[PDB]
């Protein structure tokens, strides 16, 4: 009953809280080495180089929690002009969010605290509404915003991108790519009374070399066209399996033949659409429908865990590094300290350093906790 995207907003609130108090930590630790380096009555208890890398660390830890709030999972859709890339998004999002059919641009779909329908373009803040300016308009991205409370997906900061047809424009395939570099999961919406083309395989081959380990789903859409005929169907689908096991396992070599069954699906969004807008019968629809609704799950299961690694792995790593360095500086300071009655001057830069020791110890352990938490494994 719970949407595997919970993983993601949970890991989110974790790291941000982490880097919130990480900033606070390095903030406080920065002034210690500052006031104490400046102290005219001290020889060399805290070098200026100690201050400089502390000035450095929080300078940029401010940045991290910032981009750690701008945060998002992204799945991108590709296929012939209308294999129903139109409709699949439209299906997962329980509404007609965006037209079936068309012209050439990327169409991303986010999740707003605002309550009404939305749309913004490249290169500034103007805001014109939804299907208002859809017919309107070296790549081109215009990004559709629908409201928070319409979809569990857009709540749990998933966003969906529709591409123009891989059918109708080459220009090479790489403003193609600097739109997709964000993405965690790439979906191939195939069109099933037809056959898996080469002008669609062109793309993922690049992406395979573009980006390492890309996680790729094949949605053989419009599975109604072959219905009413029980294993006229299964005949069609296994050779369809043949083209897709073909692709994922052996040319792309995405990932082996077993787990490739969890990547190839035979559904039609148009059915899943209607049954999801009916919330105020062709033979084997509830089969097709639940076929969609375990594509749902393993997608969410996949694009969930995946995205947390690919964009926290080394914010997390760098943090322990940053933490690692400040221990040594807190060492350095407590150390030159002990080397009058400004006896208890450094017996007042004694323990502050020990506090700042344990200040770090504080945050080591939590980062370790975050890693068994969301980064399997250890």
From Swiss-Prot:
Residues 79-86 are annotated as: G1 motif. Residues 6-70, 313-339 are annotated as: Part of a helix bundle domain, formed by helices from N-terminal and C-terminal regions. Residues 102-103 are annotated as: G2 motif. Residues 250 are annotated as: G5 motif. Changing residue 96 to A: Mildly decreases GTPase activity. Changing residue 85 to A: Abolishes GTPase activity. Abolishes dimerization. Ubiquitinated by non-degradative ubiquitin by PRKN. Deubiquitination by USP30 inhibits mitochondrial fusion. Ubiquitinated by MARCHF5. When mitochondria are depolarized and dysfunctional, it is ubiquitinated by a SCF (SKP1-CUL1-F-box protein) E3 ubiquitin-protein ligase complex that contains FBXO7 and PRKN. Residues 221-224 are annotated as: G4 motif. GTP binds at residues 82-87, 221-224, 268, 270. Residues 162-165 are annotated as: G3 motif. It is found in: Mitochondrion outer membrane. Detected in kidney and heart (at protein level). Ubiquitous. Expressed at slightly higher level in kidney and heart. Isoform 2 may be overexpressed in some tumors, such as lung cancers. Residues 69-296 form the Dynamin-type G domain. Changing residue 193 to A: Abolishes dimerization. Loss of function in mitochondrial fusion. Abolishes GTPase activity, but has no effect on GTP binding. A truncated MFN1 construct containing the GTPase domain and the associated helix bundle is a monomer in the absence of bound GTP and a homodimer in the GTP-bound form; GDP cannot replace GTP and induce dimerization. A helix bundle is formed by helices from the N-terminal and the C-terminal part of the protein. The GTPase domain cannot be expressed by itself, without the helix bundle. Rearrangement of the helix bundle and/or of the coiled coil domains may bring membranes from adjacent mitochondria into close contact, and thereby play a role in mitochondrial fusion. Homodimer, also in the absence of bound GTP. Forms higher oligomers in the presence of a transition state GTP analog. Forms homomultimers and heteromultimers with MFN2. Oligomerization is essential for mitochondrion fusion. Component of a high molecular weight multiprotein complex. Interacts with VAT1. Interacts with THG1L; THG1L probably functions as a guanyl-nucleotide exchange factor/GEF, activating MFN1. Belongs to the TRAFAC class dynamin-like GTPase superfamily. Dynamin/Fzo/YdjA family. Mitofusin subfamily. Mitochondrial outer membrane GTPase that mediates mitochondrial clustering and fusion. Membrane clustering requires GTPase activity. It may involve a major rearrangement of the coiled coil domains. Mitochondria are highly dynamic organelles, and their morphology is determined by the equilibrium between mitochondrial fusion and fission events. Overexpression induces the formation of mitochondrial networks (in vitro). Has low GTPase activity. This is Mitofusin-1. The lineage of its organism: Eukaryota, Metazoa, Chordata, Craniata, Vertebrata.
